[model samples]
Target: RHITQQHLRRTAEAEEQWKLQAKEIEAGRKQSFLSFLEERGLVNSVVGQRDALDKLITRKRVGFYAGVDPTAPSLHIGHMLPFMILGWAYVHGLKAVFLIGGSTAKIGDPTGRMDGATRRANIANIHLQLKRLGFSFEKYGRKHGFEWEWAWRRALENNNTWWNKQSLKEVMEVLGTSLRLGPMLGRDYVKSRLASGEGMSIAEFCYPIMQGWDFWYLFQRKVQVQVGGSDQYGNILFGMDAIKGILKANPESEWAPKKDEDPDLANPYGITTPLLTTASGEKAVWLDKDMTSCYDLYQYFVRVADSDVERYLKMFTFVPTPAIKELMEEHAKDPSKRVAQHKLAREFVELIHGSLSAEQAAKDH
Candidate 1:
């Protein structure tokens, strides 16, 4: 196929349209990620460090990852953000890593939990579930139009391959030494449970350390950046620190790691977007509501409250300033009309789930 200027122009126009709709649809909204942790949130405080990463979110070829626990047979809508964010990044030619937490998941992450629940995810079950989820991801990826052919089973795997191969003694030999029990025990979940006389487990407390080892692995794989749900900010930073620690321990390498106590955590590059929540600011509409029915997800963005639409647009859409203004003005005539919300949601659902599925979702809702 001939690469033509016209083709580039058309792609630009299409992207512009998508951006406009996204911005206008989500104006005012509650930000759950921020509320949970910001300047002095529990996770941040526990780390004794803040993120020193940056998104560098402009249109560039970049790679980012978010892990799925393999705890469930299927990922519900609650797990959509990381995938959706990757979709956005992928659209712009960025490489996205869907880190299925093989080794890390086995140990369970202690980043936010009082006890590690890895045992619940029995190895046999995890393997079976991972296979099933991989198939579903492939089916969804094609339906949604990823540029590359993504086989759910072969999409940069670590679990079944690397994880399965590691002997228990070998795994410990690599990660055991760096783990700090005291700090893990000091996590909010551990502390809260201890205070309430709730029991804690050793495996649960060591989750983050295991997760940190994953960062070292990804770095070796050349993933310069990472992203996760706001809840994962702790785990992501732990990975960052682990990588830095490794680099510091072996300074003979060509790369020079930055030395900042608590950079915006943006320099080496990291970002956590706000979570989707209900308009009232209490209930979570993103996944908690059955209303997130395909239609609701579409309408959720399209018919967002005017107070929240503009903010949502900036956070979620790529529409330029001028177009955003026009859409906002059009949406203002009647908030309930839901013209803007419908426009944004339709495009979003179609992008991730397929136009037919998007329509079916709307019809079903």
Candidate 2:
């Protein structure tokens, strides 16, 4: 109905494209956090003052977060992209903060539901999985080294800690005038759903608001960066704008950006990882041994299609880029030998499982 007019007008007038291309933005900057990510093919897109984040990372350590829902008992291989980015961030001196999407999972994100199905996870089960995901990240990132300083440096937080305490009246009184309805309605997910004649429940509609509030909550706590899947870019921006919008409308609010600092350092930033898919275009390769055996996982990587193996090496392992170049050159000489695939398989198995398990996986194979 009205959707046709909206589509027509947007096609004629809209500036930002809706396609979430799984590509990293090219960079010519000096070697640093952004360039580190750029080289690894880990970063799909950044949504914020990029230079501000670069300054923060280069000069001062910034506390950053990426989250997972307990949607399943374990993480799939696709989760590795953002986790790798977080690992690189930790290596480059940025602090780690992993959000367990406790409250967000309750309502479920409508971002990736192209099949028009609903998503909901059991709370306690998802909670455990989310915490494990966080723990797994911290362990992997710290395998090399990390300073034990502020608790927030390796913080694993649940949004429910605050969200559990907030009532409807409290949220309304605090954030009612913060985010406007029109922009919420303008999100690509919302537009597509409405235009397709599939509507969302109130809970689904409120998902982004809850996520937005989570960002604002973290902002108050001095964490200003969010990392997530590229699919969640819309939700990430909602949270970023929420922080900006709230501070703008209420400068006196406690959550206002720190005064007398490089103002950009205080701005909320988001880094989204590329959405990984199989060559055949399916998803899910579990981290838990029960779901995906170590032998099978190793074999999966060892037999990766020649075209994607090098990219996987960069994205999945900690091997430096020049060394990866050497590996690629070597493999190019005799891909039938699968020198790169074996290394990719071995390094990744070593990371997720321990060296012993990685060995056993290779041996079993």
Candidate 3:
């Protein structure tokens, strides 16, 4: 197999540098969404076990999704946690689906609340936000050299499109068989509401069922992973549980006989990122450009804790690990100058806004 040609020759130094560059590229190729989570401390948990992610990634390009309930007209920094993770997966050759909770909004996700009137007013704005964010993510991918054939698909999904096709009777029949009311009542949030006699409504109780169905739909469509905030852990599990029960009930289905423990199987999984709060443990940063202006976005990172800036860099920006480390090393020499903050602020803005805005923000800083 050594088809070496006598005329083809290179200097020893040149060969060594070539080998080094190849090694670097190989290392980069091996970086997965799981690795990014582990590196940045963004992960609270991976439902199927950590090694499950490794097996999934090695087997093939994975398709992952994250849902955003339209609680407000636009998302906030807190919502970006999973979206950022999704972006990482996209750039690393995995498929990405961004779900906007159009149907779930009607149920008013008990995790947060609003009336039907308020939700209707906010729905269009929320959909617009998702579209804008998707474009931002696409731009980020191309600018950073992540090119693939599947990139043409919109990938932005509305739960309403799928849910509209299902009849109420069909939904009730599935949830009735797959989920039990006793366990639902046992949930801490439910119990607390019951204790206060604020007793949850039928619609509120059905919210998780819809979310679970979303996962099943996506899983059947080949999205193997779901990502959300830590608060959604219970809801995420509800979806996985539904998947298990539904598949088992349909013995003729391809996924019915699959074993959960088989790492190579395309079993669905969930990942939750840490819920972000301000450095003073205050509220999350608003995501709307109006509420969180480009200047405000720049300062949010600039004001991040000295101890927290490095981790924020890894989580919020696309800067490579080695360069971030070098930046930190330089910052350590004089913490008073806040060198790391400047770099973090610049990259964070460039990610949300464009380079021109980022440059202006840096100059303003």
Which candidate's lDDT is highest?
3
User: Candidate 2, residue 191: CA error in Å?
Assistant: 2.4
| Clash totals, every prediction | 31, 1, 0
**TM-score of each prediction:** 0.63, 0.82, 0.85
Q: Which ten residues in a row have the lowest lDDT in candidate 3?
A: 6-15
Local accuracy of candidate 2 as per-residue lDDT tens digits, 1-365: 89999768765332122111101122433456776787788888889877767666655456677777656656778766776777666555456666777667766788867111222334454455545645655565566445432222456677788887878886676776777899889887888899899988989988888888888777777677888888878888888887887777777766565677566756788988887777667476777787788998998888789999877888998777888989899989988898999988988887877679899998787
Worst 10 residues of 2 by lDDT: 15-24
Rank list by TM-score: 3, 2, 1
Deviating ranges (above 4 Å) for candidate 1:
1-62, 102-111, 114-158, 167-175, 253-269, 279-303, 314-322, 359-365
**Off by more than 4 A, model 3:** 1-32, 112-118, 148-154, 258-264, 280-282
| Candidate achieving higher TM-score, 2 or 3 | 3
- The lDDT of model 2 is 0.72
For model 3, which pairs clash?
none
